[PDB]
Amino acid sequence: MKIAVMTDSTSYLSQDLIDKYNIQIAPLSVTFDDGKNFTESNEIAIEEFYNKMASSQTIPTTSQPAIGEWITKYEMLRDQGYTDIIVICLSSGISGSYQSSYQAGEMVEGVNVHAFDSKLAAMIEGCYVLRAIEMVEEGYEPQQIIDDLTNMREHTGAYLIVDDLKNLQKSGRITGAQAWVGTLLKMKPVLKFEDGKIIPEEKVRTKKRAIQTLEKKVLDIVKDFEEVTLFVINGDHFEDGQALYKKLQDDCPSAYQVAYSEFGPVVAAHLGSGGLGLGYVGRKIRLT
Numbered sequence: 001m002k003i004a005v006m007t008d009s010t011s012y013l014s015q016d017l018i019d020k021y022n023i024q025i026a027p028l029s030v031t032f033d034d035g036k037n038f039t040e041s042n043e044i045a046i047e048e049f050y051n052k053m054a055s056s057q058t059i060p061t062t063s064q065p066a067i068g069e070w071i072t073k074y075e076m077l078r079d080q081g082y083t084d085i086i087v088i089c090l091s092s093g094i095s096g097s098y099q100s101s102y103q104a105g106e107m108v109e110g111v112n113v114h115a116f117d118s119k120l121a122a123m124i125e126g127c128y129v130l131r132a133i134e135m136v137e138e139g140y141e142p143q144q145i146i147d148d149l150t151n152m153r154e155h156t157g158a159y160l161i162v163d164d165l166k167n168l169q170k171s172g173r174i175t176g177a178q179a180w181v182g183t184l185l186k187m188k189p190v191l192k193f194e195d196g197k198i199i200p201e202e203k204v205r206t207k208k209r210a211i212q213t214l215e216k217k218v219l220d221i222v223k224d225f226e227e228v229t230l231f232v233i234n235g236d237h238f239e240d241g242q243a244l245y246k247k248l249q250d251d252c253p254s255a256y257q258v259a260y261s262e263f264g265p266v267v268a269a270h271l272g273s274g275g276l277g278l279g280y281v282g283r284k285i286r287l288t
C-alpha cells in the first residue's frame with residue numbers, strides 16, 4: 001500500500017504546503033473575452049487577474065479540469081509506485097470537476113482512485129486535503145479516510161457576501177434569490193453553501209452589517225462543535241478580509257484555529273469584485 005492525496009486548483013493551497021507534501025494539482029482555467037487563456041497556479045499574480053476582469057467588457061468564463069488532465073495525473077502517480085489516490089474535488093453542486101475526476105478514476109488502469117466531493121471550495125476544500133494527508137501519515141487505509149472526511153463534511157460550511165449578484169447569475173451559480181438580482185439597492189446579500197449549492201440566507205442594509213452577519217451566523221453554529229477551524233476567504237478588497245480576520249482573532253477564544261486565505265482567479269470570475277467568505281470546519285486541521 002502507498003497512498004497519494006491530490007486535488008484540483010480551487011483548493012487554493014499555499015505553495016509551501018504543495019511543495020512540502022508533493023501535492024499534485026489538476027488545474028482549472030479562465031478564458032477572457034480577448035481569447036487569452038490562463039491556467040491556475042501560484043505563479044499567477046492575483047492582482048493582475050482582477051485588473052483584467054475589471055477591464056473586460058464581458059465576464060470571463062471558467063473551465064473544470066478536462067478528464068484527460070485527471071487521467072494524466074493518475075498515471076503519473078501510479079508510475080511513481082502509488083497504489084491508491086485520494087482525490088479532493090470542488091463542490092459537485094457548482095462544477096463538473098468532481099464528476100470528471102470520478103469517471104477518470106473508473107477509467108485509469110493499475111491504480112485505485114477514491115474521489116471525494118468536498119461540497120465546498122477554496123481552503124475549506126483544502127482542509128479535506130490536509131486531513132487526508134495527516135491520516136495517511138498515521139497509517140489509515142483509504143476507506144477509513146473517506147469515512148472520516150464524510151463525517152467531517154457534516155460539520156463544515158461557509159457563508160459569503162458579494163458586491164453584486166451579476167457574476168453569479170451570469171454563470172448560473174446562485175440558486176434562488178431571483179428577485180434580488182438587479183435590485184438590492186444599497187442592500188447586500190448574504191449567501192451560504194447548502195448541500196453543495198449557493199443559496200440566499202439574508203439581505204442586510206449595508207456591507208458593514210453584512211460582514212457582521214457573516215461572523216454572527218458562523219459563530220452561532222460552531223459554538224456547538226468540539227473543535228473549530230475558521231478560514232477567512234478573501235477577494236480583492238484586502239482590508240475587508242483583513243479586518244474580519246483580526247476581529248475574529250479578538251472575539252474568539254484561542255481554542256479556535258483562525259486563519260486568513262485568498263481565493264484565486266476561477267472563484268473570482270464567479271463572485272465578481274468584493275467577494276468575501278467565512279468558512280468553518282468542526283475539526284482542528286493541521287495547517288503546517
Ligand SMILES: CC[C@H](C)CCCCCCCCCCC(=O)O
Nearest residue numbers: 062063064095096121233270277
Ligand atoms: C468565498 C469563496 C466561496 C467559499 C466559494 C465561492 C464559489 C463560487 C462558485 C464557483 C464556481 C466554479 C465553477 C468552475 C467550473 O466548473 O467552471
